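README: folding subset

This subset contains proteins for which both the sequence and a predicted C-alpha cell string are available. Records are stored as plain text. Below is the entry for Sterylglucosidase A (SglA) (670 residues), shown exactly as it appears on disk.
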Amino acid sequence: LRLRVDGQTFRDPDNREITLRGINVAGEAKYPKKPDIPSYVSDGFFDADNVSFVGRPFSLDDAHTHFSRLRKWGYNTIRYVFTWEAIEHEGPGKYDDEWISFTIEVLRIAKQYGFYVFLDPHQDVWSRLSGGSGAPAWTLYAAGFDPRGFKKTEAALVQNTFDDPAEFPKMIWSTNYTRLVSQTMFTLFYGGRDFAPKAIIDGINIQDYLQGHFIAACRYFAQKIHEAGDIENEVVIGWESMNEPNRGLIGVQDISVIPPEQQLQLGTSPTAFQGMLTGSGRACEESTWAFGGFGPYQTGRELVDPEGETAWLPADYDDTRYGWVRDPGWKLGECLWAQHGVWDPSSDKLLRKDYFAKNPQTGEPLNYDKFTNTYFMEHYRAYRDALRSVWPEAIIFCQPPVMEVPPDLKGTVDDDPNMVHAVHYYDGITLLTKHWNRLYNVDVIGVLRGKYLTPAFAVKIGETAIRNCLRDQLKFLRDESLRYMGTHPLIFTEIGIPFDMDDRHAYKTGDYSGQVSAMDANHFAIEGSTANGFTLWLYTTSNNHEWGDNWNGEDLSIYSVDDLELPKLGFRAAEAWVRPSPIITNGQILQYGFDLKSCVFSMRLLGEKKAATEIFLPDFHFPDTHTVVAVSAGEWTIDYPEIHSVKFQRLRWWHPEGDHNIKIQGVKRK
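--- output ---
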C-alpha cells in the first residue's frame, strides 16, 4: 500500500513521513465533453438528459503526456475532480458505466507515475444549471423548478444564458450560494424533515432522496474500485466529503434582511423573501453591491421584474420521466416555502422573521456551528460508512464548510484515526479584487473567529507582515483542527490566486510580478502552517487567456496553452509555484520553506534511528552545476530518478538521529 494515516502524519511502509505536495485535476471535469459545454456556450444547455463526461479532463492518449507535467513540477498528489452529474445524469439509478470504465482507465496511467490520488466529489452552487457544477439536472426537477425562466427570475445567475457570455460578471457565480435555488437545495439536502417537512419521495423525505443517491452514486463508483484490484491503496488512498458544503437557509435568524455573517453580495442581492418573490414572477427592488473599485459598490437600487413567469415547474408539466412517486403533499406550480406557511402568495407578505431560526425537534437556536455539528456530520457519517461498506480501509478527507469552525469530533465516536481534515483557504481580497495588494492584508481567520473586534485591529501593513499574516492564519487553522477534531492530518485541498490580475496586465506585458508575489506568499503560508500538505486549486489542460478556466470567468490555472513553460509571453509565474519541497522525510519535519528571492531551500527535522529524506529540487531554481548543499550532520547525494521517462532532480539526505537541518542554495534571479 502507498500511504497510511498514523496520527498527524502520513507514513510510508518503512515508517518515513510523507509530505503531500499536490494539485487539483482538473477544472475541466466541471462541464460535459460531448457536447463540450463550458460556462459560455448557450445551445443545448437545458436538455441535460444524456451527457458524456467520458473524456473530461482529456482523452486517454494525452493522459501519460499530461501526467508527466505534474511530476516535473514536483507534485506527488492529485485531488481528482469529478461531479455527481458524471455518475447519475440520465436519472436516479442510471449510472454511466462508460464514464466509470473510462475513469478507471485514467487512474492506472496516473498510477504508473506513482501518484497519490484522493477522489473529490466536486460541486459549485449545487449544479451547473445553477451557475456552477456538481449535482445532476434531475436533482433540480426532483425539487422541480425548470431552469428556462432562471434568467430574469434571478435564481442562479447562469452564464450559459447571459446575452453576451464575454460580459459575464467576474466572481458572480459564488453569489448563487445566497440565492433562491442554492439556498433551497442545500437546505433540502441536509435537512428536509425540518424546514420543508412535506417533501416526500418514495415514502421518504427529500433529504433522504438527494443524500441517498449521492451516497449511493459514490458507493457504486467505489465498488468498482474494489473489483479493479489494482488501484485501491496502490494509487487511490481515499475520498473527500463534498466540495464546500453549504447550509443554504439553515440558521438564518431573519430571512427579511442580509445577515451580518454574509459578507459577499454583488449582482442582485435578494434576501430570502426578495429571492422568494423573484422566484415567483413578481417584482423587487434590490440593492446590487460589488467589488473594490469597480461594479455597483453601495450602488443605487435596481428593480427586478421576472414579469409573471416563475422559477418553478408549472403545475402540469410532465414529470413521468424517470420512475416517479410523489405524495400529494408535494406540489407543483407554487412556492415550496409558501405551502409550509413561510409566506403568503396572495398577500405577498412573510409569516414573520424566524422560520429558519431554531431546532426542528427540540427548539434550540441555530447558528453555523449548530449546522456543522449536526446536519453536516449527519450527512458525513453515512457517507463515511457507505464508502467503508465497500472499502473499510478508505481514508476519508473530511471537508467542513469553508472558513467555519470544524465539528468537535475530538474524543467522540467519530474520532476516526483514518480521517483527514480538508480545509479550504483563499485570499479573499486578491481573489475578489483580482489584484495582489502589496501594502495591506486582513487576518480574515482572526476576524471570523473573533480574535479581534472588527477589521481595524487586525489589518497588517508591509509585504513581510502580509506574508506572516497569511501563515499565522493557516497555522491557526491547524491548531483549530487539532483542537476540535483531534490528532489527524490536515490537507489544504484548495488554495490559489487569480491569474487575470490588473485587467489582464500580465497577458498584455508578460510581467507576472503580481502573481509571483501572490503565489510565493500563499505557498510561504502553507510551508509554515505545520500542515501535512496541500493541493493548489486547479490545473486546467484547456486554460486560455480569453476564457480563463473556461468556467465562470475564473482564471486560476497554473498551466495555460498560451503561456511558456519553464526550461512578450511570460511564464505564468511558474517560478513561484515550482518550489523545492520534502517528498518523504526520515522523521518529523520541524520547519521548512523556500525563499524565492534568495533562492534558498531550508528544512529542519527531528531524525529517527534507521530510511532517507527525499526532497524535490526544481531544475530551474537548482541547476546541478550551481546548487550548493550544506548539512548539519550526515551525508547527501543528488540523483535524477526516472519515472516513465519523466526526469526530476532529487536530493537524498542521510542523517543520524536527533536535531538536524539543511540549507540548499541555488541561483538568484531578478
